[PDB]
Design a protein around this ligand. Structure first.
Ligand SMILES: [Ca+2]
Ligand SMILES: [Ca+2]
Ligand SMILES: [Ca+2]
Ligand SMILES: [Ca+2]
Lengths: 49, 145, 149
């Protein structure tokens, strides 16, 4: 990869509250690109929801 | 030199000088050129045949290109583009330093991470949830049993 | 604030230290309690200076030291360690490798992480402004006197 590694490490250069906000942002199905979680982990939250 | 400031190649300036050979100064109209021309013509190797239209444009083009690029170096004129600007650093330098030392989520204690999860979950999943019950509730309460 | 200066672990450690001084457990530090731990460390002070080192941190003037005053003492001690060295950490943010110079590539690395982006040419504009020596690298001495890169 190249300079866009900053986009991928943007999570680790953000406050922990903001990190977990990005991880849980996969509800509306229009935000499945910024969220880096695997689909199996996403399913567990949706099952509980 | 003005044509070089307009990003012209060596051919463009030469043809520009070819059509503008009549704009060279006249000795009678300037007092400075009176003594300069007399001093210039006193050199041993100065022949009047050397003032050909082609010979004039060649030397002027060569010197002008050197003169133009020389003042680009001594006077870079790159100022007023990025002056000392203090975009936000003088007050936000602590933030950018703090960004590179921000604690990753996996290093937090479990109880702290759970509290952050609850705040994130309610704002993004519970608040965003849509449940319309007002119409159903009013309809139920408006019925005589 | 205490939360900014101290973490949860540090507060726990300070409470254990406070409980070490307070053998009684009443929640206050008396002169004899303070004197006892000093003797365990070797010092043998008198009550004249023993009271003085209590009044220097005793806020309400009751003559005893409680945990809120003990934490306030430690909070100041953590805060006043750094006075003007904040520029050292700022220099190290731009200085990824760890040497005493800021390279253009290193300046690219931090600029890449930040929001603003450079076209790989204006990066030379501000580095030559900060670097007076003209060696292409901004050292620590050049950074503190004038900060642009
Ligand atoms: Ca006591
Ligand atoms: Ca007290
Ligand atoms: Ca370096
Ligand atoms: Ca230097």
């Amino acid at each position: 990869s190249a300079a866009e590694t900053a986009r991928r490490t943007r999570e680790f250069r953000s406050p922990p509250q903001e990190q977990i906000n990005m991880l849980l942002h996969f509800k509306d199905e229009a935000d499945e690109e910024d969220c880096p979680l695997p689909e199996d982990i996403r399913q567990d939250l949706q099952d509980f929801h | 030199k003005t044509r070089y400031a307009l990003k012209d190649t060596d051919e463009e300036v030469r043809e520009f000088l070819q059509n503008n050979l009549h704009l060279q100064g006249k000795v009678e109209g300037s007092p400075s050129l009176r003594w300069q021309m007399a001093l210039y013509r006193g050199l041993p190797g100065r022949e009047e045949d050397a003032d050909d239209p082609e010979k004039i444009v060649r030397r002027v083009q060569e010197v002008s290109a050197v003169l133009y690029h020389l003042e680009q170096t001594e006077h870079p004129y790159k100022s007023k583009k990025a002056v000392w600007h203090k975009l936000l650093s003088k007050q936000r330098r602590r933030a950018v330093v703090a960004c590179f030392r921000m604690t990753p989520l996996y290093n937090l204690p479990t109880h702290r991470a759970c509290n952050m999860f609850l705040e994130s979950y309610k704002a993004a999943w519970i608040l965003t949830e849509d449940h319309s019950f007002e119409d159903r509730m009013i309809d139920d309460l408006s019925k005589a049993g | 604030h205490m939360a900014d200066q101290l973490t949860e672990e540090q507060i726990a450690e300070f409470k254990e230290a406070f409980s070490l001084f307070d053998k009684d457990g009443d929640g206050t530090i008396t002169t004899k309690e303070l004197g006892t731990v000093m003797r365990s460390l070797g010092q043998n002070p008198t009550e004249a200076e023993l009271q003085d080192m209590i009044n220097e941190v005793d806020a309400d003037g009751n003559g005893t030291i409680d945990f809120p005053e003990f934490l306030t003492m430690m909070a100041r001690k953590m805060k006043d360690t750094d006075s003007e060295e904040e520029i050292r950490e700022a220099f190290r943010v731009f200085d990824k490798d760890g040497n005493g110079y800021i390279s253009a590539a290193e300046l690219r690395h931090v600029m890449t992480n930040l929001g603003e982006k450079l076209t790989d040419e204006e990066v030379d504009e501000m580095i030559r402004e900060a670097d007076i020596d003209g060696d292409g690298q901004v050292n620590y001495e050049e950074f503190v006197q004038m900060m642009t890169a």
